[PDB]
């Protein structure tokens, strides 16, 4: 089998993409946000706490003939930004792009924190890292894909996210059309339950290539690009009057600036971001300080190829015994 959808940016600024899903029987279409860095599947539901909906669209098991309690389970998820959220589980059929799996883990969330509340345009996430990171409680559950793999033409899912425009999510082929050139494909480690791999470098601009390690986690579920404080130095110190603020929290830039691109290594390969990629608009409405898509991992704990990476690229989550990631330009 294989699955095809379209995924779409939430706001001007990429902030995130969603992602229609089709839960239930009759089916009920929530847009979720595809997160390659968890592996939990939960939904906006008739169980939320009702002051903590706002605009989302709610998956009602009860309306849904295929529905089960998975009595006794329940979940709660931190994530890396400090949001969250928590409830029960449920057992249904869920379909993306056509690819449909029976007894998929839906987890309700009874409860989410301020900033889910806040994106009236995002109905849940649908986790993509390994099922080892999902947590439910006592009987951890498999994630979509897990659940799918084995019905897949190829045990693999790509993202081909768009800048400022719609991009696909697909499951069990690699679309040849969707890149330029060869895929590069690169070793995953699976120890800490991500899509974690090494880059071999990096260039700022027109500037010379720097060899070196770089080891981060590829995530869709993370808007802009995390990377050590020295890259990071080295790329804002190309922009006159860019800044770290504190205040902020993060490096800033003029608006007036024109930004160089970024480029990363995977194996011999080169992927290039656009200058343009990396500007995330006015920090407030009407200002004049810009804030910047690369920013410092540090005091997260590791390097994050997050969106602002991800959509420079065609990317394989090569799902097989031995996982692999590939980038291709586009």
Known sequence: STGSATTTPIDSL??????????????????????????????????????????????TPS????????????????????????????????????????GQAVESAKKVSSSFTEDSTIDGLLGLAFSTLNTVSPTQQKTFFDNAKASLDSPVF?????????????????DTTAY????????????????????????????????????????????????PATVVSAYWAQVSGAKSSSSVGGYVFPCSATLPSFTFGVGSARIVIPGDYIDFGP???????????????AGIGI???????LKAAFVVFNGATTPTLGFASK
């Open 158 to 174: 790509t993202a081909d996210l768009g800048y400022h425009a719609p991009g696909t999510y697909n499951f069990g082929f690699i």
């Open 283 to 297: 920090i407030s409405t009407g200002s004049s300080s810009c804030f910047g898509g690369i920013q410092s991992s």
């Open 14 to 59: 990429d902030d995130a993409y969603i992602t229609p899903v089709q839960i239930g029987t009759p089916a009920q279409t929530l847009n979720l946000d595809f997160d390659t860095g968890s592996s939990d599947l939960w939904v906006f539901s008739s169980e939320t706490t009702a002051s903590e909906v706002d605009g989302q669209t709610i998956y």
């Open 63 to 102: 309306k849904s003939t295929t529905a089960k309690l998975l009595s006794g389970a329940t979940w709660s998820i931190s994530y890396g930004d400090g949001s969250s959220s928590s409830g029960d589980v449920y057992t249904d059929t869920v379909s993306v792009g056509g690819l449909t799996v029976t």
């Open 180 to 227: 330029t050139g060869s895929i590069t494909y690169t070793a995953v480690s699976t120890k800490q339950g991500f899509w974690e791999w090494t880059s071999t470098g990096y260039a700022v601009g027109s500037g010379t290539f720097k060899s070196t390690s770089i080891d981060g986690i590829a995530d869709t579920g993370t808007t802009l690009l995390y990377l």
């Open 303 to 309: 390097n994050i190829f997050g969106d602002v990476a």
